[PDB]
Write an enzyme that holds these catalytic residues in place. Structure first.
Site, PDB file in Angstrom:
ATOM      1  N   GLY A  54       0.828  -1.183   0.000  1.00 41.13           N
ATOM      2  CA  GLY A  54       0.000   0.000   0.000  1.00 41.13           C
ATOM      3  C   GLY A  54       0.865   1.236   0.000  1.00 41.13           C
ATOM      4  CB  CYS A  55       0.032   4.772   0.265  1.00 40.27           C
ATOM      5  SG  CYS A  55      -0.788   4.813  -1.358  1.00 40.27           S
ATOM      6  CD  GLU A  56      -0.725   4.471   5.826  1.00 39.36           C
ATOM      7  OE1 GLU A  56      -1.671   5.044   5.236  1.00 39.36           O
ATOM      8  OE2 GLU A  56      -0.479   4.625   7.047  1.00 39.36           O
TER       9      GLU A  56
END
Length: 141
Positions: A54-56
């Site tokens: 994901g983004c993190e």
């Protein structure tokens, strides 16, 4: 490789559990508690899982197929929220044939729990990555 989701924890117990929680922070905490029920995947089997990003956070996601066609999924993650979201996904998909999983979206349960409405946009990319890993696994099987 084993985990409670699909077996001892189901879409209807998640639904019954999340339905009362009207404060979103209470959903958040339930999400975190839920992910603590996900057992640690040992470094041994993180290698046999595809890394999804994901983004993190990172998640690991593997699967096997029994001879009756049922798919067992397994995974792990480092963030507690992402472990919760992965537990929700495992609850949605565990024990289903490839045929049954190409029928709906893997993420319908996140909507049914009232979880999508307030999650950050950045989560949607990781969720969507999870969905397509499931879709891709049913393609391989």
């Amino acid at each position: 490789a084993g985990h409670p989701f699909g077996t001892t924890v189901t879409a209807e117990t998640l639904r019954n559990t999340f339905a009362p929680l009207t404060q979103w922070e209470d959903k958040y905490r339930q999400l975190i508690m839920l992910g603590k029920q996900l057992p640690a995947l040992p470094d041994e089997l993180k290698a046999q899982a595809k890394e999804i990003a994901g983004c993190e956070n990172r998640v690991w996601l593997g699967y096997t197929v029994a001879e009756n066609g049922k798919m067992h999924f397994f995974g792990d993650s480092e963030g507690r929220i992402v472990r919760g979201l992965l537990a929700v996904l495992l609850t949605a998909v565990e024990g289903k044939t490839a045929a049954e999983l190409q029928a709906q979206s893997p993420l319908a349960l996140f909507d049914e729990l009232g979880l999508r409405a307030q999650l950050s946009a950045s989560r949607s990319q990781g969720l969507n990555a999870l969905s397509e890993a499931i879709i891709a696994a049913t393609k391989q099987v």
